[PDB]
Amino acid sequence: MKLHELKPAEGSRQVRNRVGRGTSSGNGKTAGRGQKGQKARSGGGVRLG
Amino acid sequence: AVPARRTSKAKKAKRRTHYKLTIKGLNACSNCGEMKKSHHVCPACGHYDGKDV
């Protein structure tokens, strides 16, 4: 392989999904957390079980 | 009471329409011909009604 023609195997790497970066992305504003509630807070959610 | 809405440039300019200066009463002086205010002593030659003062 040539350093100027590198190519990963198909499906080996994916693009990270960034939330809170506009509405059209599908995770804008609420960042997929919903509206209000405990699970919508930073550090929110109840302990496992 | 406070301005509920800011005044736009157009409305501001409209209001200032009449906020202008005026210059009136200027005409030539008999003695020296320079411009002077009517009924006032010509400041340059100090003459009024054809006499020095």
């Binding site: 509405t23 059209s24 804008g28 504003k29 | -």
Partner: protein, 101 residues
């Protein structure tokens, strides 16, 4: 003389020596095209197609193929944090009318 012909789901008035814009025709530029659905012929006399004037045809030459000015469809609903922007350029064919029969 002039004619009225059916083309692209629409009716257009045509005179010899005039260019008309119609929906994209599957014809190369500079080629002859014949509109065989003439719904009227007017001028000194009047021929009324019922629905089409029998044996009447209009001839033209495809001057150009082009795209109209872009149209932007921007759909959004207020207060629903949602919008969708879309572009369009409708293809068209410019045809010079040569003969009316």
């Amino acid at each position: 003389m002039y004619a009225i012909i059916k083309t692209g789901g629409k009716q257009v008035k045509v005179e010899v020596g005039q260019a008309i814009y119609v929906e994209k025709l599957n014809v190369e530029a500079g080629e002859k095209v014949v509109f065989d659905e003439v719904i009227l012929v007017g001028g000194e006399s009047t021929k009324v197609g019922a629905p089409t004037v029998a044996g009447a045809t209009v001839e033209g030459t495809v001057e150009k193929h082009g795209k109209q000015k872009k149209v932007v469809t921007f759909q959004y609903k207020p207060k629903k944090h949602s919008h969708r922007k879309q572009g369009h350029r409708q293809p068209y064919t410019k045809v010079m009318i040569e003969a009316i029969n």
